[PDB]
Amino acid sequence: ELDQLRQEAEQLKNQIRDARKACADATLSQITNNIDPVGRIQMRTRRTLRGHLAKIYAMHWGTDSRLLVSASQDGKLIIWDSYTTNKVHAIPLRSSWVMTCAYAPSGNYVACGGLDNICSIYNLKTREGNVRVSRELAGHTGYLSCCRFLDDNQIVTSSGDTTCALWDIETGQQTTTFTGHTGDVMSLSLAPDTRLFVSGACDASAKLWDVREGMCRQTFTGHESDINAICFFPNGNAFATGSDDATCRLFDLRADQELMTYSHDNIICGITSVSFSKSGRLLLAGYDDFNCNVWDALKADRAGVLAGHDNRVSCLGVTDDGMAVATGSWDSFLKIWNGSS
Amino acid sequence: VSAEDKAAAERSKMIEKQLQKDKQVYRATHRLLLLGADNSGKSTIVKQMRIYHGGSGIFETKFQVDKVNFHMFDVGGQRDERRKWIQCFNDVTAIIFVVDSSDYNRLQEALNDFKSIWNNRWLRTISVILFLNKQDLLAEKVLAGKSKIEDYFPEFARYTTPEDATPEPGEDPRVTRAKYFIRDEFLRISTASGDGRHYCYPHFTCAVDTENARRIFNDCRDIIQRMHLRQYELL
């Protein structure tokens, strides 16, 4: 029985690998060999957002592409007007340790979470004139690593208990609980259509679920270590995983395989953040090596380096309109890089 | 810059002033990361020193010694198989590792956990304050004699009490040998790799012990003294 169950699981896995190999005929590099490779890309730090007291673990651009929110270990969530560097808001936090933050798609709310296992969501636009805890979501038995907003009433969180959760804000209860992961889940990326969402974990696997029904639609493996960051492709049919093995791997939803590995022998430090550009051609990945890399998502070459941070780049986000890329590192500094020409 | 942008700028200036006011306090206090086995009396030390504030999760305990504030962080109700959140605590002043010395069944697991914490990549420069808690229970158990450390550790037979060791005058010599054998077991891993970057401070404490705050303050003073020696180009 149990031995037979393991044997049939192994046969199903082998059939999966055989089907993937049958579907695999040409690497995307061979297809893109005819495209013009992008030249060296240099990005200037237009603004530096000074004011955080310690290392910054997360940031999230607003959907207006102007306001951003950043979370640091001093128990502080600072909302900056990136255009003029002005500090729009400064929210003190109940727990000094938050490893994530988020911005509501409407912009009315912000979210944070960390080692307290509670997702604290704050209402920015209150008649009270100040910021208050709109809700404190509880139900996770591990540290919360990343939370993203489907809308003003639905949120999606991932935690260190190898579970993700979909929370209805009014009820404050886990509408759906995604439990298919073996290791700790770090990063989740909401699909542009917000019907599916992917999340990478410690078991060297990225699982893509659907929010409505709530089962693991797809599972992607290939990484050798814990997957640290994840980001959906702008079209929603692919995503990218950055892990501790110092390689970024691009997975394709429809093919259900691994496209290429953005790995360079020069760099050995693991990945801390991965995100795409508006057109999806540039993949920007912050590393433990105190600087970020910018690869060509279809040629797997290092098209540029973003090196202005004295410490490791913990978080890195791209505006919805693709105007700039804001990177927050452990030296308390958020740098808004942008093109030159 | 218009009127509204100027008002936003003054709002940002007020926020920056509040940020500096908070930076004073943040730099004024030292953050300590408390770790230990589930049974290793860590909550007992936390309660004996001060009162914690939950919110499984984070346990905050702010205590003041000699006008210096320390902030102990107990990460409970979590699976300690990798401690992958430890990257958050890569800047703590000290890691307070509390180990129950009266459980030889879990003593090897505690030693392995200390080996993992000491040789951790992110805690390379973070010093460890080692609290060998529950000394009274250890003394009672080794005084009873029905439990032998020899069957758990075969190097106890060839182990002798160090000449450095300072025991209490009314304390049994076998108690001293057991205590210092466990302390040397920890210090072996402490000295295997931690030569200059960080140090392990061992302490013998019990549940009724009340000077743990003073020991933590002194160890933090030594840690910051060495940190300033390295930083101010004296080392």
Epitope: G129, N130 | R11
Partner: single-chain antibody
Framework: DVQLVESGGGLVQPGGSRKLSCSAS????????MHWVRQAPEKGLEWVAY????????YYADTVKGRFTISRDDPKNTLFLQMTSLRSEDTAMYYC??????????????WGQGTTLTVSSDIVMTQATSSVPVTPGESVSISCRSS???????????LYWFLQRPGQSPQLLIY???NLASGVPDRFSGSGSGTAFTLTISRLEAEDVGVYYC?????????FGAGTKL
């Protein structure tokens, strides 16, 4: 909650100084800048004074410069105007108005129930139209003009539209032409270019009867405009 009560006023002599207080209850007064605004009897409005959060910036109107003062008591959540050498033109309604300034904010949120005072260059607003039929169910548009275009380099045009009910304090309708206040229903809208400003109402209800006012915020003289009665 979020209410600005006011006290003081009454019949006063021209040579007597007066204290006119506004107390804020139900919102964070410390982080809000404040304004004092005057309403002449059966006339338009005119901004009198302003003080930023923390008393960093204090601005006074050109007509009352040198004899008026403002200061804030944050622990008591109080803002009082001290008035010296009262004139015959100070016989008017007075309103204490909260104002918070950041990106996306509506920096005239609540106008408290003011107090009456009885005594025994700058941007100008035209608002040529002054009388409109009170027939409901129509689609009335209220027009306005500015001496200088309110559009700035940033992109936001600092035009504000208020409605003052016959027996209640004025309320925000629009804090900027392309956006609408919180408590105001989706019935109102604003649109325009340069100096030409228009307020549009799709359907007219009985609670929409009042006086409409327009204001600029590009220049801190903050001169109002002559109201329009429906």
């Amino acid at each position: 909650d979020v209410q600005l009560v006011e006290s003081g006023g009454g019949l006063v002599q021209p040579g007597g100084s007066r204290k006119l207080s506004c107390s804020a209850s139900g919102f964070a007064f410390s982080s809000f800048g404040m304004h004092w605004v005057r309403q002449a009897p059966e006339k338009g409005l005119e901004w009198v004074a302003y003080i930023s959060s923390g008393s960093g910036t204090i601005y006074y109107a050109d007509t009352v410069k040198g004899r008026f003062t403002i200061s804030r008591d944050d622990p008591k959540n109080t803002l009082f105007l001290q008035m010296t050498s009262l004139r015959s033109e100070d016989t008017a309604m007075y309103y204490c108005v909260r104002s918070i300034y950041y990106y996306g904010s509506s920096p005239f949120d609540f106008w408290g129930q003011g107090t009456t005072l009885t005594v025994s260059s700058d941007i100008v607003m035209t608002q040529a139209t002054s009388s409109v039929p009170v027939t409901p169910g129509e689609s009335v548009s209220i027009s306005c003009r500015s001496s200088k275009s309110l559009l700035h380099s940033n992109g936001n045009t600092y035009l504000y539209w208020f409605l003052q009910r016959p027996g209640q304090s004025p309320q925000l309708l629009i804090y900027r032409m392309s956006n609408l206040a919180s408590g105001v229903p989706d019935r109102f809208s604003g649109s325009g270019s340069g100096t030409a400003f228009t307020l549009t109402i799709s359907r007219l209800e009985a609670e929409d009867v009042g006086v409409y006012y327009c204001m600029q915020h590009l220049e801190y003289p903050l001169t109002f405009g002559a109201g329009t009665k429906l």
